[PDB]
């Protein structure tokens, strides 16, 4: 996932959520790229959908 | 054709349509991703944008042209119906066609429609921390009159966790969380103290670029309902406060559980419109 636009704190609060390698759902893709820059990009994409 | 979104008889604003009351001459704003303003379904009058190298009109995520239409998709022969259809809709781009956005630039979109006379914001977003400056802008928008409403957040629930974000969280917005059609919470919808009122979140038909429709999901979806539910409140009574439309919303709602996880309950127009 392109992650390199982020961070940025605000997120639209549509729910389309992303499962990452670390079995946490993310609410959508914002939520995501945030956890993945968190990380340091250890974070990746398990797969579209909830854990 | 058109059709009508389940919401709108759900929070009983096809009620309040038929009394003649629509939202006419109030102003919302929708602070979001823009709006696609050619679409064939909205009338989008003016707005801003705060986002670098992006207009106001253009919508590249589609979020903010479903919320708007939520609010205020037009009366007519094709595509869907708004809460409250004949607003002056305004879109104020403070997310970029990513869906994200910085804390400045929504301040800048409050501050925008505070400024230029909006009745209503609709905030569809969400940040875990807020920022002192989006408490500034949202006190101010509220003590000035505006009606501001805002997504709950999408975090769910773990046993007592308050899971609502910012700017939800703040006493001078309205934290709006999601029911299904069966005026179920939605699982997403965020808890806690500062959860005010629900609306459907589940399944949301709406408008979406380019001219075409969508079902989505998320507190940004309830949150609409409520802002155009307010337009119309404000088009029926147009001298009622800021917080008297509020506190109309909050206490005529329908029971649904405890507050914690449903606020009040359901919004009911009809009722508040009272
Ligand atoms: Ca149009
Ligand atoms: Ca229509
Ligand atoms: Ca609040
Ligand atoms: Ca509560």
């Known amino acids: 996932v392109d992650c390199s636009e982020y961070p940025k704190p605000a997120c639209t609060l549509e729910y389309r959520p992303l499962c990452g390698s670390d079995n946490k759902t993310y609410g959508n893709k914002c939520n995501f790229c945030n956890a993945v820059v968190e990380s340091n990009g250890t974070l990746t994409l398990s797969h579209f959908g909830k854990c | 054709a058109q059709t009508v979104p389940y919401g709108i008889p759900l929070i009983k604003?096809?009620?309040?349509?038929?009394?003649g009351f629509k939202g006419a001459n109030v102003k919302v704003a929708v602070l979001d991703t823009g709006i696609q303003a050619s679409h064939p379904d909205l009338n989008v009058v003016?707005?801003?944008?705060?986002?670098?190298?992006?207009?106001?009109?253009?919508?590249?995520?589609?979020?903010?042209?479903?919320?708007a239409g939520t609010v205020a998709a037009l009366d007519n022969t094709t595509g869907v119906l708004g809460v409250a259809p004949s607003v002056s809709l305004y879109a104020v781009k403070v997310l970029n066609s990513s869906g994200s956005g910085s804390y400045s630039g929504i301040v800048s979109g409050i501050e925008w429609a505070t400024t230029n006379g909006m009745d209503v914001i609709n905030m569809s977003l969400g940040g875990a921390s807020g920022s002192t400056a989006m408490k500034?802008?949202?006190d101010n928008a509220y003590?000035?009159?505006?009606?501001?409403?805002?997504?709950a957040g999408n975090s769910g629930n773990s046993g007592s966790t308050?899971?609502?974000?910012?700017?939800?969280?703040?006493?001078?917005?309205?934290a709006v969380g999601a029911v299904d059609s069966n005026s179920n919470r939605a699982?997403?919808?965020?808890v806690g103290a500062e959860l005010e009122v629900m609306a459907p979140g589940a399944g949301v038909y709406?408008?979406?670029?380019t001219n075409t429709y969508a079902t989505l999901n998320g507190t940004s979806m309830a949150s609409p309902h409520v802002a155009g539910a307010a337009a119309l409140i404000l088009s029926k009574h147009p001298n009622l406060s800021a917080s008297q439309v509020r506190?109309?919303?909050?206490?005529?709602?329908?029971?649904?559980?405890s507050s914690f996880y449903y606020g009040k309950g359901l919004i009911n127009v009809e009722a508040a419109a009272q």
């Open chain 2, 136 to 138: 500034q802008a949202v």
């Open chain 2, 162 to 174: 308050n899971t609502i974000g910012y700017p939800a969280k703040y006493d001078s917005v309205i």
């Open chain 2, 206 to 209: 709406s408008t979406y670029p």
């Open chain 2, 143 to 151: 003590a000035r009159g505006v009606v501001v409403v805002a997504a």
């Open chain 2, 46 to 67: 003016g707005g801003a944008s705060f986002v670098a190298g992006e207009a106001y009109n253009t919508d590249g995520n589609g979020h903010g042209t479903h919320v």
């Open chain 2, 187 to 190: 699982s997403f919808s965020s």
């Open chain 2, 13 to 19: 604003a096809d009620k309040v349509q038929a009394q």
């Open chain 2, 247 to 257: 506190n109309r919303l909050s206490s005529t709602a329908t029971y649904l559980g």
